[PDB]
Amino acid sequence: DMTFRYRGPSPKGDQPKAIAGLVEALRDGERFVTLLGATGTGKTVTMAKVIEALGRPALVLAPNKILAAQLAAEFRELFPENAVEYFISYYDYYQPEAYVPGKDLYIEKDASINPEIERLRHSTTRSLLTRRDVIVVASVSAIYGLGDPREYRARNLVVERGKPYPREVLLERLLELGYQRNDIDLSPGRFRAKGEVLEIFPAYETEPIRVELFGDEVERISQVHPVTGERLRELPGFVLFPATHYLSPEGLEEILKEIEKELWERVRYFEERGEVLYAQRLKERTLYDLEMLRVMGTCPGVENYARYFTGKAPGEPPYTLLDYFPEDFLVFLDESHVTVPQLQGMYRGDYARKKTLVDYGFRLPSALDNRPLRFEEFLERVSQVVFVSATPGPFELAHSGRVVEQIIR
Amino acid sequence: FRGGERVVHPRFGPGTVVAAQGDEVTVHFEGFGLKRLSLKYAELKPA
């Protein structure tokens, strides 16, 4: 009753019984529970009552970004005072890198990307570390790979007013958090320093922060409007979280060395096979990528090298959004009959795409380690799953210990 | 749990642990049959 504050309509009819039935199932420790028949507003009202009753952070997956947006909006109304995050990915809107051999066609990752996507993703991980009253609503792309959250947690930056913090150190720690310097265009995940004035745009923020320095002392802190410069608030201080989710305790040069080692092995493989074109394709793309990394700390498609930034071993499952929750979160799978098959086939479908890229020299084999979880890998990262559907599919009915009805036609 | 252990569940009563894979424990209960449970939340006590 303390974590979340439900401000919405009261359930009528038998809906209180469906809420109680789910709460009973989950408090029993049932691993698989099905809500059957719920539709429209009553669906999210029941979920919300269950989430409030149990007081745990919640992950809610939808078949696609559009339905996730609808769910998030409903949840924002039912919990106006809690963090309702919306988690989506590039792959919800744009075509991935791919190569179809039958037509000798390379499809590049879309370079012109909406910055809102990374902003929402960063708002999500920021909330999941800073508070318990989080409900993340996401497409199935939550279970695609992400970086080490142990480093995301540990690599923060605390600024208080009326204290230094000398200047040249603040710019060092900003670059350590992945913030690029751009004085022309200040967009999220970037900073600007002219004189004793420092403008920091946190990767999760809609409004950058203005830090004014008098010598070492932090003279003034103000949150500023992005387009007009208008001061909107004064800040006593703030905690800055990183600007990428791929953060390693190993050094960048060391990482780039590990990657080049794999590059030359793989070129040796192609060259020994007479596949000159694949080797030179692979060198051009990989070296270009590492050079963008070395100079800017990040590159487009850095997630291809995710194994090297997380210390995972080949074949090991990667970190996902699942690792950014506290230990006791709760999963709902909306449109269970669609969402479960999606979860089941993420790996094989992703693997199919990247294996072609790896076979023909577009990517190193290590890129296969930046992958969605296998369905049993998913089921091992979660404690309890609530399947939500009016037409629950075979997996839900085969494995649920409880199936609670909510038929309001 | 290794399997065979006697446990007691706050609502299902006496049961016997069948399997255990990580946080998932499978317990067979007199009244309710086989249950696939989460260890964090089952509140199992040893019998």
Swiss-Prot record, chain A:
Residues 24-409 form the Helicase ATP-binding domain. Transmembrane segments: none annotated. A motif (Beta-hairpin) lies at residues 90-113. Keywords: ATP-binding, Cytoplasm, DNA damage, DNA excision, DNA repair, Excision nuclease, Nucleotide-binding, SOS response. It comes from the Bacteria. Its main location: cytoplasm. The ATPase activity is stimulated by single-stranded DNA. UvrB is stable up to 80 Celsius degrees. The UvrABC repair system catalyzes the recognition and processing of DNA lesions. A damage recognition complex composed of 2 UvrA and 2 UvrB subunits scans DNA for abnormalities. Upon binding of the UvrA(2)B(2) complex to a putative damaged site, the DNA wraps around one UvrB monomer. DNA wrap is dependent on ATP binding by UvrB and probably causes local melting of the DNA helix, facilitating insertion of UvrB beta-hairpin between the DNA strands. Then UvrB probes one DNA strand for the presence of a lesion. This is UvrABC system protein B. It comes from Thermus thermophilus (strain ATCC 27634 / DSM 579 / HB8). The lineage of its organism: Bacteria, Thermotogati, Deinococcota, Deinococci, Thermales. The gene is uvrB. The chain holds residues 1 to 408 of 665 of the full protein.
